[model samples]
Target: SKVTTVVATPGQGPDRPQEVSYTDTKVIGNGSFGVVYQAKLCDSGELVAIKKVLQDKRFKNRELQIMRKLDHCNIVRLRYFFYSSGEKKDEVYLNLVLDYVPETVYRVARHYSRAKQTLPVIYVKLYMYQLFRSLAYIHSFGICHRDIKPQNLLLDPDTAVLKLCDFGSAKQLVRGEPNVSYICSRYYRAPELIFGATDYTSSIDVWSAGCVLAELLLGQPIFPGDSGVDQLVEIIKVLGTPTREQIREMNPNYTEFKFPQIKAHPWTKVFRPRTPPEAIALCSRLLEYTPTARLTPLEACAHSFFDELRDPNVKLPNGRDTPALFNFTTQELSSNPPLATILIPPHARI
Candidate 1:
């Protein structure tokens, strides 16, 4: 009959602190960063993800700061947050209350792979399109989600709505500011990041997205490397060799070493026999040796690969009309007005 309550501040808008109570809390996940708990709110009976992390009193938490600034359907919502006392002296933990997404792209993809079946083309298209939309929103604000991987892409099982989560490595990259080159997951790391480029752009995320697209199409990781150096070797196996210019584009200092001459692999041959050309074309644009050459998130959204999504009669495999794929916020639309008309199809305008 006991209740757990805390005076917490809302994730966004006016900071009106209030008593938020919850029950049936238990650890759902844990890692080096923190522990995640699944809990039921007493008032609304809503399930929420409570992420508890060590708090450093010296400064504000970066994840918390970025989450409060972001508000998008394709991104996880930060409901509330509060501080909690730890066992040791001066030990405090920050608990972030977030929307509970039921599934993840990683889990979904794994299920398909385990069953020796590929994820349906429609599903792959839907998930990737929504991901690009989220990327477009974040990149417009100069924020770079340093970590982009299948694990970070959350999904609602019933609605099939995808949401980008885990902003732990996210940062609002500035023009002249220096950043860590060692970022992103191993399999999804962009070539520039692998080349040790601290000045890389948000397009790195685009490259990771490209990897995700390819994985869904291939039913397995395309470039599965054993180590950091091996990762470049894996990339070279398909991309052939990075040119001097391309090397300089990634990281000027890292171009001193010469690599072996290898012929570039055809994109058509990379995937299965029946893979759509549009998907291959989109993948080519996203996964490029030159970071700047990679397609922008908005550009990816408008690609022919997503043309099916723009179709008037398009429906989910489950027969639902569709999720809010066209509900672009003013902030999202203002990013590129020219592409706005094309990105949002005629049928969706009403």
Candidate 2:
């Protein structure tokens, strides 16, 4: 059987047939997983978005593995893929083939405080709830999305909907593994993780959903930190430390988890519940410390936060966040995407 592969360069133009090469245009974005570049697919010359791993050490087929395993409208679509020619035949080089979104995440969404290009708070709540549902969906498949942050989620700027992307570190927790101690990103890491926890469950991602909701509300990273210890202190200060017994069930050895040394409460409780009750309650559910206590995403979709748009609107094709393009601006989009700028392509991008 032939081993599969993908393009490893961000927006590295497709290798044109007969010495053909693609052009690098705009920078769509960057993340812990990879850098996204906009470009055209060689065969069709259609707009398509491409994401390439920054370090070659990553598994070339990892993204493809995840994409093939998933099928959801709320998730980013992988159109096709190809492997790149590297110096050595053994050198791994890959690129993702995806539907082109000319409106990459606008920086304005990250800075919602300014308000001009910001997503509506209502929409943010709706999107956040949807995100919770997606996470729950991932968990249902018995997989863990170890990394779940605003940066990892791609928003349709025109429609204000979100597509969960970049699952480079995601994995299913198998039975009988002892002493799994890997910590996710400091800021988004869960309380059990902060407390030197092992054998934790899907609550880690739910806690991340809380952080993302907070980001949407405040327009900045709430638990921003440069070190693991610092991040532990930041989270504990705001959420208050949870007792060992509170989450001891998730990990039988939970009491043995080591906690960082932090003393006083850090943040003022302002903006605590100025938002709707449904929104605030749902966000609180995600930020909880106990893994088992965390509400699953499917339950979140049933949350009242999405009461206005859940059942009726969700089923409608045009009612989705896709057709409208969220809150992006023309100046915010990069010209260097993988697919053609034209919405209706001649054949299909990538």
Candidate 3:
């Protein structure tokens, strides 16, 4: 078998560089971001994903820096990062060696859609619970995942473990420092970002997570808009026009408010009648007009909608056990001691 080998540094831990070899490589995915290739390591015969992107020597890659700092089971692992010369003279490409997750939430959701059926409520619960846990873990470090959507959520079909990936748009938000407001996928973009807020916090991700939950329950994007203005219109259709205070909360600089008044669409009507009231209630708390009004990722984790996941007897629909949901690190519990009490279910406590 053909082999491609490189001297690489481990993603985390002390600097001890060594040569790594892999073979059976083939392009698995590509986009404006770059290309991702599937390859198998020669030593362990383990599958991996190689995300290759053009690297500018002037600045450190934000995604690489953030991924190095993050260590969570629900987030994709970055095993190694190596710099490879590009085809063009003096060009460099950064290769991120990552764990290979075979499916995405987008593909899985599409599977159910094509079958003319809704995704099982248990799956929605499982995936979203894991997502919130990931959000909680990242947010604890004051890191904001600007992009949150189904496509970026990696899924292991057999185990049903959902791992958050694609940190190209993630940033460690520093207070008072302005960041690009034009980030995140349009459908999952928060209303604050849409309103041109640059000093926004991680709560923006909470709003996006809300949208993902809504999309899963509704069988399609709830606020599918083709353009920026149209996107706000879609949001208004469901949330109604923002009041002066609401607009002020979104962005104090957003002075021009020219829009028609509309009554807030009931959340009940947003999805099919069979949708659980608890699900709708959780969505309401997440998709708030004001950023602070949105539930913190940890708070969302404790929502009653996810109570089934905390049940000692509950299991994945496949009859397999659920992934590690209650393994909270000390840093994760440092946020709020009261919430930690609610977060760790009685049965989960050893």
Candidate 4:
């Protein structure tokens, strides 16, 4: 018998015709691989967003393999898969079935937009806390969601269900695994990675999560740059440049790369966390120079910001709370949608 990788597989086609009744919805997002379309699930009439990956000659092996094994609430769940004819097994177009969330990034305070100036702080903090909690859970299961940013995180302020999508670049924690390519977007990458730290661990994901938290709070990304040097400088601008000792302590491999000149710049002294006391403190912990020392997502979730709403009866996907934002970005600003309105799995709709 062939090995069964995930709990569920798409197989030849839908097992039960009534289980999934598909209808065309709006084109929510587009990418190089395919487009995201919002549709309804027949069995429960739930709205769902599906990404149809091309059955192109050039395919992503890691994405297909990892997606099959991954099942997490904070992360997008692989609902099902089906292989297309006239294509090799690898060339099968991947229908990435996931929850359909009618939410976008917004400026926390005034529900600000990209065309506007900086947003307020309240909504920023709300998003920051949620992102941290989710990422922490992902790491706990020994997976690295290498790419995490406002663009990757789906949101509904009313429900507070900010689900992470696009795990094409994610990695499983294969022990004793070394020399894996350092794959991550530049802006959200860690300082060590910028300085050529290839032997990093899940800390890379934590660092990216930390950046997302800060961005949601500020109504913009903390480090908005494309180059490695610029990303380092962007973070250092706010966190302040760290000394060689700090860098080495965080990562002994720092010295192996062409590090910058030493300076007597006060790291945290000059750097001020642009968030509330609770969030500011949490950011500090999440943004540790050392990957191992970074606060876990579960620990971050336990912070005061999420204290009021951390109810066992409420699941993250179904719990939407309109984030307050007068100074928020347009993407972050929205009238929070109904929890069930977004087509997530019934199991996640706690």
Candidate 5:
């Protein structure tokens, strides 16, 4: 149990650096981007996740920059950050100290699937509502979270609070600027991205969220494509072939390509027999072929699918109250002032 100390800059404050001490470090996750270690702070005894990624001397890390600008309940918090010398003389590592969330939507969904049970509907509403709230907040700042898969959604199992994490692929999108269309994960990739649209909008994340909702309802990935082109095939099977105008909306270059017509499968048959109509309705709206047709995050938040979440009497399956869902900041509601009436229930008002 070795204690480590370092001078770190606070994630959301003045640039002053202060000494921080932590112990009981152990690797919790590792990926191409970097390693995530779980550690406990010696002073507050609170657990934190340390994500260390190799950094280049030439440029500032995008993840660190985006994380610092974000502050929301559904999104993970960045507590502190510091740089360390690497083995190579010119190499360095950027370490981000983040809030420690123990479980993820992926792992939790897998557990239900393995047990031959579907995740409870209320939990789905609770999780997805918070996700939209997070997206709405970030989109307001022009930040697009290019990756919105279930793995990036962290959960506090005890409280059933879901927090969006992993900002490695996030970027502040500007109009007229081209972005790589080969972004986002395969199953969750928006149709525009698959169509090679470099001018896609944050609505790509909406499509991914729709997939997440569909998966939770059906107890499996709604789309199980193995490759990029095949991913569009899977989508076509459910949504039917996109019209020429719809293709134009996605990317003008793809408007001339011939595609076989396939009538849409009824939303009723997409999920199990007992799935809620509101849930299916919400999925249809979010998964539209045209990017602009997809519901805005606030619109999704106000959808009837999540109306159950607005009830003051609603609670987790275990009897615990649901996590904070209606604490909307003025900035979050400013996008559409009318939605404030629907977004916050009467009981939730101060």
Candidate 6:
């Protein structure tokens, strides 16, 4: 019944602060970082999520800084941000207003799992394609989304549009800078990170996306590890033990580390018998032990597994047109212009 108003700074474009009002606030999610409330904008009547996190007085909020610079269809948009005084004395909170996507890939996948069914193959393609698009967009700017689990991917159930969210762990990597190795979730963490590599590249996100793809295809997490060591054990069980050279490539300091020799599980046998061969091929490329061996996000977009999405005739299972998949900005194609011939179809060409 109550409405709250504040002068908020727009997340993009010019910095002219304006008064915004919202109401019908309800807690939708909360974590160690902060609380997220679902609210409706009074003026436009649009739904939005307000993420309120405790702000450190000394340091600027990196998430806010990063979110402000990102603008893409497959990535969550930050509409406005404002600071509010916290309940405790001298405490402050940073409130970020973002587009409220109703579902997540995690929840959607779970719904299918609970019903003893797998997500439709078309959805796996649609969602994962948009994810790669978002990744390609950000990685072009040298930003690494340290966390890339299914939960971080927001889904609009109707349109099958997926937006990458949660920039709390995102960072623009510099060549010589050291980053904390203990980042990204366990199941999706790159082998390099588990090997304690602090100077890793954005390819880490590629590994996580690989895990998500594998999970969706198998109807469960591919690496269901109970602990960090077990996570590696789980990976090794499928991909086999990392070779000495591969270990060196992951982290030079681990060259001498010993692991029992295990034969790599055949990729085809790893998934259900009916799983498409192209999907397995894509998975193998993304989950490479050598970080650089992984396909860049754009390359993954142009992979054969996503060829169906490039076809103008494809539609959602419910007979709805698939989300826009070929709208590439020049910056997105700058990484590898040659792929443009394969990435966009004639029907999608403007």
Best by TM-score: 6
lDDT for residue 322 in candidate 2, whole number 0-100: 30
2 or 3: which has the higher TM-score? Answer: 3
Of 1 and 4, the candidate ranking higher by TM-score: 1
- TM-score for each model: 0.97, 0.71, 0.98, 0.70, 0.98, 0.98
Off by over 4 Å in 3: none
lDDT of 3 by residue, 1-350 (tens): 89989988899765787899999999988988689999999989999999999888888998899988888989999999898995688988999999999999999899888887899999999999999999989999999999899999999998999999989889999999999989989998888888999989999999999999999998899999898767888999999998889988888988545788899999898889899999999999999999989999888998999989888999887889988889888887666657867778899888
Candidate 4: stretches off by over 4 Å: 1-19, 55-61, 69-71, 85-91, 106-122, 179-182, 249-274, 308-350
- Residue-wise lDDT of candidate 5 within 83-141, one digit each (tens)? 88856677789999999999999999999999999899988998899999999999988
Candidate 4 lDDT over residue span 199-251, tens digit each: 67777777887776666556566688767677776766666567667687555
Once model 4 is optimally superposed onto the true structure by TM-score, how far is the C-alpha of residue 315 displaced, in angstroms?
Answer: 15
Clashing pairs in 6: none
Q: Pick the candidate with the highest lDDT.
A: 6
Q: In model 6, state the lDDT of residue 315.
A: 86
C-alpha lDDT values of all predictions: 0.89, 0.59, 0.91, 0.59, 0.92, 0.93
* Candidate 6 lDDT tens digits, 133-239: 99999999999999999999999988888999999899999999899998999999999999999999999999999999999999999998898878899999999
Worst 10 residues of 4 by lDDT: 325-334
lDDT of 6: 0.93
Two-way lDDT contest, 4 vs 5, winner: 5
In model 5, state the lDDT of residue 339.
Answer: 98
Tell me the spans in candidate 5 whose CA falls farther than 4 Å from its real position: 255-257
The residue-by-residue lDDT of candidate 2 on 1-350, one tens digit each, is 22223333322234332322344446686776556777765546676676766336553455566666666556677665555645555655556756664332325465556653445566676567557656755676667788787666766655666677767767676656643555566777776776666666776788887787766765666788778767766766666666667547545554534565445342335234455566667767777766777776655555667655533234323354333222212222222122113321333223
Please tell me which model should have the higher lDDT, number 1 or number 2.
Answer: 1
Please state every model's RMSD to the true fold in angstroms: 1.2, 10.7, 1.1, 9.9, 1.2, 1.0
Error of 2 at 319 (Å): 10
lDDT of 1 by residue, 26-117 (tens): 88998777799989899999989999999878888988998999899999999999999866688889999999998999999999999999
